Amino acid sequence: AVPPSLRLPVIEAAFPRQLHPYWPKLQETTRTWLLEKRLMPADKVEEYADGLCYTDLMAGYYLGAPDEVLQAIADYSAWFFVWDDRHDRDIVHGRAGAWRRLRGLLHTALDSPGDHLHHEDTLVAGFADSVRRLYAFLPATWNARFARHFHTVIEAYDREFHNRTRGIVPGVEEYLELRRLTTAHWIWTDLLEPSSGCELPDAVRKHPAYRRAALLSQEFAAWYNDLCSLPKEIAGDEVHNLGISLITHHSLTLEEAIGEVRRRVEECITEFLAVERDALRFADELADGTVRGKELSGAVRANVGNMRNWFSSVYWFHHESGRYMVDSWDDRSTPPYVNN
Ligand SMILES: CC[N+](CC)(CC)Cc1ccccc1
Ligand SMILES: [Mg+2]
Ligand SMILES: [Mg+2]
Ligand SMILES: [Mg+2]
Numbered sequence: 001a002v003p004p005s006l007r008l009p010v011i012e013a014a015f016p017r018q019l020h021p022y023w024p025k026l027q028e029t030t031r032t033w034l035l036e037k038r039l040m041p042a043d044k045v046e047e048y049a050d051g052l053c054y055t056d057l058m059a060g061y062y063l064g065a066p067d068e069v070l071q072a073i074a075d076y077s078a079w080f081f082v083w084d085d086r087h088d089r090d091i092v093h094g095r096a097g098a099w100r101r102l103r104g105l106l107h108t109a110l111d112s113p114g115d116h117l118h119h120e121d122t123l124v125a126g127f128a129d130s131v132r133r134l135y136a137f138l139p140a141t142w143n144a145r146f147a148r149h150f151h152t153v154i155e156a157y158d159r160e161f162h163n164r165t166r167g168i169v170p171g172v173e174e175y176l177e178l179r180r181l182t183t184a185h186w187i188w189t190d191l192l193e194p195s196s197g198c199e200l201p202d203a204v205r206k207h208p209a210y211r212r213a214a215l216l217s218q219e220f221a222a223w224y225n226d227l228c229s230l231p232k233e234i235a236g237d238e239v240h241n242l243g244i245s246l247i248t249h250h251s252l253t254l255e256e257a258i259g260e261v262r263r264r265v266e267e268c269i270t271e272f273l274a275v276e277r278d279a280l281r282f283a284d285e286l287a288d289g290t291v292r293g294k295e296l297s298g299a300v301r302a303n304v305g306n307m308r309n310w311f312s313s314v315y316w317f318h319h320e321s322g323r324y325m326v327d328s329w330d331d332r333s334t335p336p337y338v339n340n
Contacts, residue, residue, distance in 0.1 A: 002319050006228055006319070010266070010270070011311055011312060016312065017312045017316060018060060018063050018309050018312070018313075019056075019059055019060055020060075020064075022059070022067045023055065023059035025067070026055045026059055026067075026070060026071060026074050027055045027056070029071055030071070030074045030075055030078050031049045033078070034078055037122055037125060039079065039123065040337070041339070048336065051321070051322040052081070052322055052323055053317055053320050053322070053323075054077055054078045055078070056313075056320065056321075057313055057314070057317040057321070058070065058073050058077050058313075059313075060309060060312060060313030061188075061313045062191065062192070062309075063305065063306055064195060064196060064302050064305075065194070066197070069137055069194050069195055070195075071133075072133040072134050072137075073134070073194075075126075076130035076131070079123075079127055080184070082123065083123065083127070085335075085337070085338040085339070086102070086123055088338065089339060089340060090161070091161055091164045091165065094165075096165070099158075102123065103158055105124045106124065106154050107151055107154055109128045110131060110150050111147055113127070113129070113131040113132040114128070114132050117129055117132065131146075134146065134194065137194040138193060138194050139199055141199065142190070142193060142194070142199045146187065146190050146191075149184075149186040150184070152186075153181050153182070156178055156181030156182045157182060160240055163239060163240070164237070164240075169239045169244055169245055170240070170245055171245065171249055172245045172249065174245075175240065175242060178240070179222045179226075179240070179242070180215075180219075182240065183222040185215065185218035188218060188221075189214045189218065192302075192306055192307070193299070193303070195302070195306065196298070196299045196302040197299065200299060201296075204286070204300065207282055209275055209278035209279040210279055210303075210304070212278075212279075213307050214307055216271055216272040216307075217272065217307035217308070217310045217311065218310075220310070221310055221311075223242055223261060223264055223265050223268065224314055224315060225314070225318065226241045226242045227261045228318035229318070229324055230243050230261075232323075232324055232326040232332075232335070236333050236335075242261050243257040243260075244257075246260055246261070272307075272311070276307075276308065280304055283297050283298075283300040283304060284297070286300060322337065323335070323337070
């Protein structure tokens with residue numbers, strides 16, 4: 001039963017959940033990978049990993065992905081959650097040097113992941129393993145685009161480190177721009193392509209309806225995370241959340257801010273529904289009778305279908321995952337699954 005303040009009847013009625021058939025194997029394989037890569041302690045893996053639902057989140061999103069693609073994506077996504085936790089802990093403990101060094105190593109590993117498979121920092125080694133595997137599916141031009149996007153993501157995390165150390169809450173537009181990077185909008189969008197087996201040409205993926213559908217799917221993910229993760233984040237002195245920007249700068253109350261975030265989330269859904277029609281029309285137009293046209297049409301259609309699936313996967317993940325269950329923790333500021 002979703003809390004009333006978080007419930008979205010449109011998602012529940014009109015965005016039916018999907019689950020990839022590889023999910024049962026995926027859950028165990030990513031748990032084993034977190035253990036083998038030492039990304040979490042063994043006892044915390046055993047107690048918490050399945051309950052975190054990270055594999056479920058990806059298996060509800062990249063429908064149709066080959067199993068090996070989904071495995072690499074799921075391992076990368078679990079890594080990404082552990083990195084968010086590492087970042088948080090470095091901020092809380094004032095580890096500016098450790099963060100700066102990790103930031104530099106991730107930029108280097110992202111360009112040369114094979115070189116870093118056995119790095120002393122298991123967080124760097126786990127990143128490099130997942131990225132090397134993601135770089136094995138499509139041409140180097142796709143890999144270069146993934147890297148360009150993730151270099152930008154690393155720098156947004158650096159900006160968050162400085163905001164939280166200086167106590168700066170970004171303004172609303174500043175925040176919204178930053179949040180397209182800390183959510184990694186363009187990484188998840190890039191990953192649609194190995195999932196459907198096709199690197200899309202710039203003229204296809206930059207088509208206005210493809211771009212706007214992709215944007216709105218990720219804005220939903222970001223802002224619905226903000227709505228659901230607000231309690232854990234207030235408890236943990238996190239400053240990055242649309243609700244916090246609204247409270248801090250527009251003098252809204254917590255109740256007013258939650259309402260405004262919810263309204264922005266709801267409008268994202270119905271803006272998506274409008275553009276989804278145009279993006280599927282474009283998929284139709286690509287099927288011009290040629291072999292290449294059929295390939296591009298089917299890839300666009302699968303990708304736009306997964307942009308839709310992200311809404312239901314994100315919605316349910318926030319109510320199933322132990323990541324956000326702050327009421328269940330003895331110390332609300334220290335989630336039991338992080339390394340403190
Ligand atoms: C792994 C995803 N992420 C940011 C990229 C890491 C903390 C948080 C997130 C979870 C769910 C929806 C949106 C963002
Ligand atoms: Mg976080
Ligand atoms: Mg974060
Ligand atoms: Mg959050």
